[PDB]
Amino acid sequence: AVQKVVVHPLVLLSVVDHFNRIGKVGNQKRVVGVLLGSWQKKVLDVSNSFAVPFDEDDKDDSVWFLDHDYLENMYGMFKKVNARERIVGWYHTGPKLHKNDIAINELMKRYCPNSVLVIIDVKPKDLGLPTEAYISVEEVHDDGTPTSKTFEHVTSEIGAEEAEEVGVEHLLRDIKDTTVGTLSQRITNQVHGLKGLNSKLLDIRSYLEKVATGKLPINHQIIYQLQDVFNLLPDVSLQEFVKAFYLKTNDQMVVVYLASLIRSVVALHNLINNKIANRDAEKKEG
Amino acid sequence: KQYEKSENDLKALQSVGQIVGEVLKQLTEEKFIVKATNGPRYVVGCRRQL
Amino acid sequence: AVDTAEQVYISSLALLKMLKHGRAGVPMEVMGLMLGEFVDDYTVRVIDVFAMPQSGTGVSVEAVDPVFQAKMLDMLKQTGRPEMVVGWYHSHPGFGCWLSGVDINTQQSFEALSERAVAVVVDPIQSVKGKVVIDAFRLINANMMVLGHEPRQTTSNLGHLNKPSIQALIHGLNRHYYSITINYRKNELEQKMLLNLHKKSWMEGLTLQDYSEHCKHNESVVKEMLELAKNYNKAVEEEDKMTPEQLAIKNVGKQDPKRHLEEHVDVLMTSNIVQCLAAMLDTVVFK
Amino acid sequence: MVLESTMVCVDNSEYMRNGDFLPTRLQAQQDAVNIVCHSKTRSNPENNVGLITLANDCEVLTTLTPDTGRILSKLHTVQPKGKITFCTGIRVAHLALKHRQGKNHKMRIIAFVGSPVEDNEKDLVKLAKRLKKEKVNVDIINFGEEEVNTEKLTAFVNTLNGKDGTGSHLVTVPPGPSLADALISSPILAG
Amino acid sequence: TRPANHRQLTFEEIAKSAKITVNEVELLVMKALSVGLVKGSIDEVDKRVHMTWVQPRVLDLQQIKGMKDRLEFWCTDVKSMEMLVEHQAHDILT
Amino acid sequence: EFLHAQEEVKRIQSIPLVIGQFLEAVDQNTAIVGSTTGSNYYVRILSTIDRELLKPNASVALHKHSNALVDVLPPEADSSIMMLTSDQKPDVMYADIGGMDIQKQEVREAVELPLTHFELYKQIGIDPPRGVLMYGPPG
Amino acid sequence: HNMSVKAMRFPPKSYNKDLESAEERREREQQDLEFAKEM
Numbered sequence A: 001a002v003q004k005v006v007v008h009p010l011v012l013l014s015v016v017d018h019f020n021r022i023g024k025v026g027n028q029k030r031v032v033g034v035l036l037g038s039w040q041k042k043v044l045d046v047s048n049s050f051a052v053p054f055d056e057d058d059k060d061d062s063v064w065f066l067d068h069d070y071l072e073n074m075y076g077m078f079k080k081v082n083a084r085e086r087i088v089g090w091y092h093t094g095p096k097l098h099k100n101d102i103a104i105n106e107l108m109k110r111y112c113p114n115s116v117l118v119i120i121d122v123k124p125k126d127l128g129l130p131t132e133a134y135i136s137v138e139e140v141h142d143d144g145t146p147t148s149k150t151f152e153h154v155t156s157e158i159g160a161e162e163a164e165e166v167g168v169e170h171l172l173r174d175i176k177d178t179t180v181g182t183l184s185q186r187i188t189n190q191v192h193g194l195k196g197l198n199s200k201l202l203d204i205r206s207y208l209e210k211v212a213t214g215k216l217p218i219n220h221q222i223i224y225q226l227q228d229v230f231n232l233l234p235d236v237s238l239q240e241f242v243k244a245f246y247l248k249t250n251d252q253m254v255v256v257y258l259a260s261l262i263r264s265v266v267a268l269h270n271l272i273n274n275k276i277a278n279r280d281a282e283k284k285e286g
Numbered sequence B: 001k002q003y004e005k006s007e008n009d010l011k012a013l014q015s016v017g018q019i020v021g022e023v024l025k026q027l028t029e030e031k032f033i034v035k036a037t038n039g040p041r042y043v044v045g046c047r048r049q050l
Numbered sequence C: 001a002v003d004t005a006e007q008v009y010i011s012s013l014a015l016l017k018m019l020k021h022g023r024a025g026v027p028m029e030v031m032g033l034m035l036g037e038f039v040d041d042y043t044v045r046v047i048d049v050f051a052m053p054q055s056g057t058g059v060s061v062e063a064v065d066p067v068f069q070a071k072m073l074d075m076l077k078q079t080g081r082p083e084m085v086v087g088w089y090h091s092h093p094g095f096g097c098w099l100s101g102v103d104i105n106t107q108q109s110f111e112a113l114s115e116r117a118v119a120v121v122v123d124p125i126q127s128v129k130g131k132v133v134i135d136a137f138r139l140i141n142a143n144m145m146v147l148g149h150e151p152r153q154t155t156s157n158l159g160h161l162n163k164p165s166i167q168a169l170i171h172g173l174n175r176h177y178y179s180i181t182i183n184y185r186k187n188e189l190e191q192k193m194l195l196n197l198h199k200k201s202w203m204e205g206l207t208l209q210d211y212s213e214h215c216k217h218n219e220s221v222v223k224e225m226l227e228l229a230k231n232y233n234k235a236v237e238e239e240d241k242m243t244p245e246q247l248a249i250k251n252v253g254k255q256d257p258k259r260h261l262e263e264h265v266d267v268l269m270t271s272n273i274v275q276c277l278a279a280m281l282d283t284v285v286f287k
Numbered sequence D: 001m002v003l004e005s006t007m008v009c010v011d012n013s014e015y016m017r018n019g020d021f022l023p024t025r026l027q028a029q030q031d032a033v034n035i036v037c038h039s040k041t042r043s044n045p046e047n048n049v050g051l052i053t054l055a056n057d058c059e060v061l062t063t064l065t066p067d068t069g070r071i072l073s074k075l076h077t078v079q080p081k082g083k084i085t086f087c088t089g090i091r092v093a094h095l096a097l098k099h100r101q102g103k104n105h106k107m108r109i110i111a112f113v114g115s116p117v118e119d120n121e122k123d124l125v126k127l128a129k130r131l132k133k134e135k136v137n138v139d140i141i142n143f144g145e146e147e148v149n150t151e152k153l154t155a156f157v158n159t160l161n162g163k164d165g166t167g168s169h170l171v172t173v174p175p176g177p178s179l180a181d182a183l184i185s186s187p188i189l190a191g
Numbered sequence E: 001t002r003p004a005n006h007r008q009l010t011f012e013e014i015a016k017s018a019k020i021t022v023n024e025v026e027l028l029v030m031k032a033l034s035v036g037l038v039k040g041s042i043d044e045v046d047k048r049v050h051m052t053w054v055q056p057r058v059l060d061l062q063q064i065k066g067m068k069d070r071l072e073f074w075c076t077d078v079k080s081m082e083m084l085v086e087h088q089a090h091d092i093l094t
Numbered sequence F: 001e002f003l004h005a006q007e008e009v010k011r012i013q014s015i016p017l018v019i020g021q022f023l024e025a026v027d028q029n030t031a032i033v034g035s036t037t038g039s040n041y042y043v044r045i046l047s048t049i050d051r052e053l054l055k056p057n058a059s060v061a062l063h064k065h066s067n068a069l070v071d072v073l074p075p076e077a078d079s080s081i082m083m084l085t086s087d088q089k090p091d092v093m094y095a096d097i098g099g100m101d102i103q104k105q106e107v108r109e110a111v112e113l114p115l116t117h118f119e120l121y122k123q124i125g126i127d128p129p130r131g132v133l134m135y136g137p138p139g
Numbered sequence G: 001h002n003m004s005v006k007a008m009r010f011p012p013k014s015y016n017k018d019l020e021s022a023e024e025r026r027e028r029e030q031q032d033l034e035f036a037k038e039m
Ligand SMILES: Nc1ncnc2c1ncn2[C@@H]1O[C@H](COP(=O)(O)OP(=O)(O)OP(=O)(O)O)[C@@H](O)[C@H]1O
Pocket: F096, F097, F098, F099, F137, F138, F139
């Protein structure tokens, strides 16, 4: 249904500054607010947002309130200043999936059909992209409850924009691993990539924590993919993999050989262009 | 009402010209190229809604 | 008095609101207000920008709706946190920056409340990375212009550092308004969470890139690269000839083998080595 | 005038489903809400009146607004049907009053119970001493029918006006479908 | 049950393990490929079939031991092959 | 550090772009152009322009004020665009023209025969005609 | 190729001054700029 989401740096900071402006509460407050934007060509977009006044008590943590008058007036001001901009869903600050974040979506689903939530990060650290979005799916199914509803994570990324990149690259001024050559991919995905595979190997190990000791439901819907992985582990080295592999390596290194074969001659020509700049300058000038 | 009709010209005298031009071709989605009824040819953009 | 060292601290967010609101409705001079704490006589640190919707068709800074900034003012007072009105802005769109005669009047309406309201121009076209063209100004009194008295009584070597743009200097620049050297406030809280999140691939370097057409493309450069090497077997042959400054002017109609040649060696290099290494880590990582 | 904000907690439970008092319970307690919100409105223009419930799904049917047209529009064919859950009625009455425009207001709540309650008195004395720790005066007015000599409510109001609270009351329900205006003519006269 | 080393059975082995004749096991496995529980090719002249995909079944807390162990030394092959990347690719980018 | 400056310079090629036409250069990277305003100028140029993209008679881009080279352009003409080929054929068959056996075959030789069969003119080398004139009484 | 690089860079010499634009013509640019700015 929904392919993926588009998140901007403007909404990205536009949550964090609100976490700063309610950061004086000290004890506990989650930044929940209203997520604005479009979705076009089956691609979710997030352009604007604001935050709603919200409080919560730990005793009886099934009670939430959104001042929907404040939702009406300010979004009326936002449709007014920008008729193109509209609602796209909501968000909460999302450390660890708080429990009112099952009906916050069912509370305000009367505005957006796919009333999407976004989990953000307040203390930014990972080896990946700490931006999360779920989606609401419900099920009269299998065996958990006759009324069952659990969010499912749609893939999430930071959408860029030509307007905002002036501010992005303007406000970086720190470091930027450009000069995309033979080593950009080496570090963005060959150094960072295998350590990308590290945590994905680690998460199935975190599920493996229930061999006899973990939570009481066992598998049901985990083990078809698990059997599928070790079923679909790739082909071993006995056939033409090493052959045709040696064939195609044995063809790629031809092109490498030609490129290195030119490059030396080019730089040699350049040195001759220097010795003309030396020998007929030493006698001329002195 | 006499102050309101003369209040219509209190702000109504503020529209600016919109020089009569002509579309030569279109380079990219926002890069356009035109020439008016005046002289030379220009490279121009539009509004994002139009 | 002032010392012309006025050092405006703004934000990290207000720049983004100014570029977005200045960019979406860009051919009209869009405007709005500035919402930050007024610190001491010299500096001002304005943390937030909220925009105002326009009035009608027309490039103007027409009017404020104190209904709208009244309810807007108490809106965040009863949701977020209270702040303070200080300044205001508009948008000379693709101009640079100055105070027009229209801009100076609505400025003059805003200095009457507090004497240190702020005139702010954004120019969201001529700005790329290191360019923003902001330069917040404020009115100087034309009374003292009749006095012939030089204002602002420089006591710090902080004012006369930037040199003024001439398109502003055409305008009231040195007779009706002054510039302020500014900067921004950023922290590690923001830097990492935008640096680690903008251009990040996922598993792309761990792919093969069209394994029947990587090598096919590897011919699809070599084939014309041969004849480009025949131009390279051509252009050296008119040396020990007319001086190479003539070989600098003379080669602006027809292509060189020299630069075009070293281009494709880089291209065929980086195209091959990445697929070659990426093809071989998977043989160990996968079984 | 004086700083408060009225948050009426209507009873949309499945035991609020007869035509016993005059017209209907819905119009009876509805117009009761209308005249007491005209009382709170004309006594102080700052007070806004919204309605929350204490049902299985404690919906904000109307947002806390000084307008009553949303209240009158939603209360028509409102279907006040559902399983009563009073144990979340305290928190759903309270956390809205912390969501409000001013914590400087007097936290005043009227509560309508017209159904048999299945709460624990230990749970509402935990929530009652919680409201002692939150300094909240709630005046509970009983409607409909109930377990007569309202059970767990005298201990809740007693454990509400305790520790120098001493200002709250418990209007208990008469089990006669009379005209309900004189049933609430005492809270509109004195507190 | 057969590992991913071979998983190549023969029609004599079906004729033993299912005691059904030579001229009906092919009609059995064409029906099996039509249904789609198993995915493998059929050779007629070498009397062997190259079965590749099996329908996934369920399992107790004992198969997770073997899947855990085949996972465990598969971690350190990623550690080991990555270690040359960190060591040799150290000076390309610090 | 340098790559900060490298892409930085291209702000001048923003959007308020006026059009000239390249004429020649005095030297490397400083030139003379012919504006669409009618006057000609001695201008400077952006360094990233491939200079070997220049001069059929090059449609170039000028800064509106500082009046220097900005960008090289794909060609443009505002005449009959290109005879749009869909609703543009004047649906006239060769058979519609009766009695022009010599001249229809002769112009076929002159126009589209060297267009296709170019290497006979090249190979024998009989100098295929540049332009062709046709006249006579009207109708 | 590396040796055709390492043997190459001895030439780089007599690179005396990277003069930006000028001084007196900059004074004329701010002078005529001051004329157009007053104008
Ligand atoms: N086979 C034909 N040979 C000569 N003329 C013909 C033929 N068929 C029709 N005509 C008529 O002769 C006219 C020639 O058309 P055309 O417009 O080409 O004339 P023309 O030679 O261009 O003279 P003008 O320049 O005055 O138009 C047509 O209008 C048509 O009616």
